[PDB]
């Protein structure tokens, strides 16, 4: 069929919302499982599925038999597969701080782990691609997060109340530069026993005499990671609240975290992750440090600025891998065309999609796959349609 309603995986990771997807989209959850992620794509560990005409088949399997017709010649020749995973994330808990290594260091890490024969899907495994994979997050409900290091004077101002927590903090305050920020970071991560509890106790005292942000975020996080050096991170990293509709592109070598809410996320199937706190897992600190750019990002540069053309709101991404756009539906049809495969996801309202004689309804939280050889489709309705595709 021209258009293909997707049967999508729900990953029930422990940190998921028992309710969000049900509330938002009317997805059934009788057993009240935590629903962390809704997957839309062709990931080899849990592909989306389509219905033959009336049996269900893997979308990954269907692409593989029909690569050029389904992906477009461009995508088939650049990547050889669907180059994106599209997700709905429901953080009912705050998640680990993460860094994605750059291209050079990803190749090395990918090769190091492969030389040691670590299976691609082991917990030990941190590098699943030789490349640096980009990542876009797009807020569906108010979405709390950290992203990148704050401006140095901003960090100074935030550390003053906790100056006595660790000498590495005092060191930074004296000369607040990139180098000492690096030593401060590593030092917090490596605190042990009574050194760590000493620093935690200073921070806790502070929480009792400081108001608003990012103190309030630390208070929230501490309910889940009360014994984590990561509690110091909102003093170092930018605490952002995305409103519905806003987006952030996550650069390499830049610590970030998802703390609360529901969001769309676009990524590769395979990425590389170094953990930088808010985790019980062991961290290789020198490696982490070697993969971090200790460079402030001013607040005004956090959100990717969309570009509106007609009914199309594009979110420009400095990568060839995937593109992201939001389409305002109206009752009069507009044309949604691309040179590649595309996944269409109704954000809100309701979409009618038309292809010649075929028509297909998406209520909020539902998605269809459009093979390259089937563009364009006509869309009408109310609310908003989200599209992941490829511009090449
Ligand atoms: Zn990430």
Residue 98 Cα to ligand 1 middle (Å): 6
Residue 256 assigned to a binding site: yes
Write out the DSSP string of 265-325.
Answer: EEE-SS-B-EE-SSSSS---HHHHHHT----B--GGGSB---EEETTEEEE--S-SS-EEE
- Among 92, 95, 94, 96, which Cα is nearest to 35's? 92
Report in angstroms the alpha-carbon separations of 151 from 79, 157, 211, 213, 220.
38, 10, 20, 16, 23
Which is the catalytic residue, given 49, 60, 180, 275? Answer: 275
3-class DSSP state of 248: strand
Q: Is 222 left (phi over 0), alpha (psi -120 to 50) or beta?
A: alpha
Which of 268, 301, 334 is the endpoint of a domain? 301
Active site residue 384: no
Token pair belonging to 77: 């020749």
What is the phi/psi pair of residue 184, to 5°? -60, -50
Q: Do both 180 and 53 map to the same domain? A: no
Measure 272 CA to ligand 1 centroid, in angstroms: 9
The structural domain count of the chain equals 3
- Structural domain containing residue 339: 1-6+302-392
Say how many Å lie between the CA of residue 19 and the centre of ligand 1.
24
The CATH number covering residue 186 comes to 1.10.441.10
Q: How far apart are CA 150 and CA 298, in angstroms?
A: 6
On whether both 91 and 216 belong to a single domain, the answer is no
- Asked whether residue 82 falls in the same domain as residue 171, the answer is no
Is 229 within 8 Å of 277 (Cβ atoms)?
Answer: yes
CATH number, position 113: 2.60.120.10
Specify the DSSP class assigned to residue 165. S
270 and 338 co-located in one domain: no
Between CA 139 and CA 308 the distance in angstroms is 18
CA of 208 to the centre of ligand 1 (A): 31
Statement to judge: residues 229 and 328 lie in one domain: no
| 281: its two tokens | 């897992």
Relative orientation angle of helices 167-174 and 152-159, to the nearest 10 degrees: 140
Q: What are phi and psi of 302, to 5 degrees?
A: -80, -50
**Could you give the residue ranges of the DSSP H alpha helices within the chain?**
20-25, 59-65, 67-71, 73-78, 103-115, 152-159, 167-174, 178-190, 193-207, 215-222, 285-290
**Is 21 in the same domain as 100?**
yes
Ligand 1 centroid, distance to 262 Cα (angstroms)? 15
Please answer whether residues 321 and 328 qualify as being in contact, where contact means their C-beta atoms are separated by less than 8 angstroms.
no
Say yes or no: 26 and 130 in one domain: yes
Both 341 and 193 in one domain: the answer is no
State the pairing for strand pair 342-355/49-51: unpaired
The candidate with the shortest Cα–Cα distance to 262, out of 278, 279, 276, 242, is 242
Q: Name the residue among 256, 254, 249 with its Cα closest to residue 291.
A: 254
Same domain, 139 and 216: no
Residues 232 and 308 in one domain: no
Whole-Å CA distances, 25 to 11, 46, 109, 343: 16, 21, 39, 17
| Ligand 1 center to 250 CA (angstroms) | 6
132 marked as binding residue: no
- The answer to whether the annotation marks 100 as part of a ligand binding site is yes
**Experimental approach taken:** X-ray
Question: From ligand 1's centre to the CA of 195, what distance in Å?
Answer: 30
- Specify whether 52 is located in the same domain as 118: yes
**Residues 144, 57: one domain?**
yes
């Amino acid at each position: 069929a021209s258009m293909q309603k997707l049967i999508n995986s729900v990953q029930n990771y422990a940190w998921g919302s028992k309710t969000a997807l049900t509330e938002l989209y009317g997805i059934a959850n009788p057993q009240q499982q935590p629903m962390a992620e809704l997957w839309m794509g062709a990931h080899p560990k849990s592909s989306s599925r389509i219905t033959t005409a009336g049996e269900t088949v893997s979308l990954r399997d269907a692409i593989e038999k029909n690569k050029t017709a389904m992906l477009g010649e461009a995508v088939a020749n650049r990547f050889g597969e669907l180059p994106f995973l599209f997700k709905v994330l429901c953080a009912a808990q705050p998640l680990s701080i993460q860094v994605h290594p750059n291209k050079r260091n990803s190749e090395i890490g990918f090769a190091k782990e492969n030389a040691a024969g670590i299976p691609m899907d082991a917990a030990e495994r941190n590098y699943k691609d030789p490349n640096h994979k980009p990542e876009l997050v797009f807020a569906l409900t108010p979405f709390l997060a950290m992203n990148a290091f704050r401006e140095f004077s901003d960090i100074v101002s935030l550390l003053q109340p906790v100056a006595g927590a660790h000498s590495a903090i005092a060191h930074f305050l004296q000369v607040p530069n990139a180098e000492r920020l690096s030593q401060l970071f590593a030092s917090l991560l490596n605190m042990q026993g009574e050194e760590k509890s000493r620093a935690l106790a200073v921070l806790k005292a502070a929480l009792n005499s400081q108001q608003g942000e990012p103190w309030q975020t630390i208070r929230v996080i501490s309910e889940y990671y009360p014994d984590d050096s990561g509690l110091f991170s909102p003093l170092l990293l930018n605490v952002v609240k995305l409103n519905p509709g806003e987006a952030m592109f996550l650069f390499a070598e830049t610590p970030h975290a998802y703390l609360q809410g529901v969001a769309l996320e676009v990524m590769a199937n395979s990425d590389n992750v170094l953990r930088a706190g808010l985790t019980p897992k062991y961290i290789d600190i020198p490696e982490l440090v070697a993969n971090v750019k200790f460079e402030p990002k001013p607040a005004g540069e956090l959100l990717t600025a969309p570009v509106k053309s007609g009914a199309e709101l594009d979110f420009p991404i400095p990568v060839d891998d995937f593109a992201f756009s939001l389409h305002d539906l109206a009752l009069q049809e507009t044309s949604i065309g691309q040179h590649s495969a595309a996944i269409l996801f109704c954000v809100e309202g309701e979409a009618v999609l038309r292809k010649d004689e075929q028509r297909l309804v998406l209520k909020p939280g539902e998605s269809a796959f459009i093979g390259a050889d089937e563009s364009p489709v006509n869309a009408s309705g109310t609310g908003r349609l989200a599209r992941v595709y490829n511009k090449l």
